[PDB]
Each structure stands twice: as C-alpha cells, then as structure tokens.
C-alpha cells in the first residue's frame, strides 16, 4: 500500500464532480527518489460518494489494458486512489496544443486505441457513461488512455442497461437520447457517446466547435436551465445532429453518424469501429 505521510502534493490536475486529481511524489526514502504518481480523492466526501468510490476503485483495479489508465493502489487517512502520472495531459489539452502537428492518421491511431479500451470494458460490462477528450489521458505521442472511471457503472446480471438519475449537472450533450429521456446506459449509447468523441477530435478542439456550442446555436442560445435538455431532446428526435468538422472526410462522418442512430440496436458495435477505423488508417498509409 501506500503512506500517506510520503505522498508529497505537487500540483492540482483536475477538479470535478464531487473529487480533484492531484500530482504527488510518493517518496518514502525522503531522499527525493519516488516517482510520481496521480491521486485522486473526493472533494466533499460524502456516504454515498465514498461507496461510489469503493466501487470506482475495484472497477479500475480489476482493469488492465494498455489504452486503460494503471491501478497502483490506494491510501488511507479518508480515502484516495493512487494511479500512475500520464505527464502529456488530457487528451483535448494536448490535441489543442499540437493541432499543426497531429494529422488524421494520428487521430485515427488515437480513436483505435479508444475503441479497443472502450471494447475492454464491455467485455466486463462495465459502463463508461461519461467519455469525453477530457478524461483520455495522453501517455506519449503514440498512446492514450482512458483516463477517469468516476461515473462507470456494471451492469446487472439481467440487464443490457443501467438506470440512473444522478443529480447536478450532467455531460448532455455528450449523451445518447434514451439516457436524457430514461436515464438508460449502456454500451450502446457509450457508442453514441464515442461517436461525440470523434466529433472532437476531428474539430481538433475548435473552442466554437464543441458539441455545447454546436447544439446551443441549434437550439438557440435564448434557452435557459431546464429547457435546454428539453429542447435538445427534441432535436435529436428530429434527427438533428452535429455537423461534419472542418477538414473531416466524409467516411470519418459516416462513423459519427452511424454512431448517433436514434434506434439504439442500430448503432455500431465498438469491435467493428475498430476494425472500421484501422481499415481507413491501412488505406491512408499506402
Ligand atoms: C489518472 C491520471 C493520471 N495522470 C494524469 N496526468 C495529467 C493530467 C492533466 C495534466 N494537465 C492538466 C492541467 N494542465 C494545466 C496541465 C496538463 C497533466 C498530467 N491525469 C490523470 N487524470 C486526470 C487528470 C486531470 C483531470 C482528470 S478528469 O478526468 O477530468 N477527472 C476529475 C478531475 C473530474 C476527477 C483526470
């Protein structure tokens, strides 16, 4: 395990939901030779947010995958988990930084190892629900993974989705509709939700390109609080969807499209985006 008087606090990385990632050194020889690592630890802890902990511990402790981030341990007085430190970032940060240097063959190295990691989780069924640029994380130039498991769910024995209503504010417009309608997750619309990720990157995070901004000009921005989600429902019930980025191909598109069918057994498995994606990939190469 791991002492909680030789983790030395370093820097903040994030701050969200109800928890904040931190760089630390675990250094205990106090001869400044630890490595550093990443810890995670809940911000207002709560009951019901340190059973989800637990929970989001052993999720991630019984994960290994070269695209999924390393389960080092956890640290006890308060509860923290200890993972490793990816040191290039977000993956939304870094593509922003690099945008000249990063073209569609590197996107699309990047949205294999998503899939293949996304794949690894169904495989357990695990839920994902919250995919986004923000939390795959950015090990070196030639690798990503996914980075945060706080909203991840198993699903139960006896069902291919998982009901839940949480409150505050939720990632929107990053949802399928039948999770803003009836609150169902599943691999399907973790799908959806992966087709919103490669949205992103094909914007290469163009600040007036996100999926908010994007959706809110297509709702109108007179929209307030509550009737947005209600007013976003809608327009995906009318097939309303975000426009093909900038520069993207029309077959990268057609993934995307595919990705957000209304009908949810329609959408594209995550084994066949891979296959999909590494075809494009192989036919850009020669
Ligand atoms: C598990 C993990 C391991 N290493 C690193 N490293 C890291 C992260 C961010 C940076 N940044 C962000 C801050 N910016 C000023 C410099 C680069 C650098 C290294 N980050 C990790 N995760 C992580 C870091 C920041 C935010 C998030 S998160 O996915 O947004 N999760 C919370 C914050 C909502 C809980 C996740």
């Not at 240097?101 to 990047?110: A, F, N």
């Not at 090990?139 to 209503?165: A, C």
């Not at 077959?251 to 057994?265: G, L, P, Q």
Request: glycine share 6%; hydrophobic share 35%.
């Amino acid at each position: 395990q791991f002492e909680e008087r030789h983790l030395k606090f370093l820097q903040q990385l994030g701050k969200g939901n109800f928890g904040s990632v931190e760089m630390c050194r675990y250094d205990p020889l106090q001869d400044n030779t630890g490595e550093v690592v990443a810890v995670k630890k809940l911000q207002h802890s709560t009951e019901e947010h340190l059973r989800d902990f637990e929970r989001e511990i052993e999720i991630l402790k019984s994960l290994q995958h070269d695209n999924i981030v390393k389960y080092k341990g956890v640290c006890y007085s308060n509860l923290k988990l200890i993972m490793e430190y990816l040191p290039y970032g977000s993956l939304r940060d870094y593509l922003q930084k690099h945008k000249e240097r990063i073209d569609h063959i590197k996107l699309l190295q990047y949205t294999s190892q998503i899939c293949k990691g996304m794949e690894y989780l169904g495989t357990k069924r695990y839920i994902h629900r919250d995919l986004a640029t923000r939390n795959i994380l950015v090990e070196n130039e030639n690798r990503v993974k996914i980075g945060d498991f706080g909203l991840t769910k198993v699903l139960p024995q006896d069902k291919e989705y998982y009901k839940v209503k949480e409150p505050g504010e939720s990632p929107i417009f990053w949802y399928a509709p039948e999770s803003l309608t009836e609150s169902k997750f599943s691999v399907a619309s973790d799908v959806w939700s992966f087709g919103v990720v490669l949205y992103e990157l094909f914007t290469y995070i163009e600040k007036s390109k996100s999926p908010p901004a994007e959706f809110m000009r297509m709702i109108g921005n007179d929209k307030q609080g509550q009737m947005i989600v209600f007013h976003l429902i809608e327009l995906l019930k009318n097939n309303g969807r975000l426009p093909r980025p900038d520069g993207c191909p029309d077959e990268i598109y057609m993934i995307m499209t595919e990705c957000w069918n209304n009908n949810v057994n329609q959408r594209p498995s995550f084994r066949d985006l891979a296959l999909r994606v590494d075809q494009i990939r192989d036919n850009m190469a020669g």
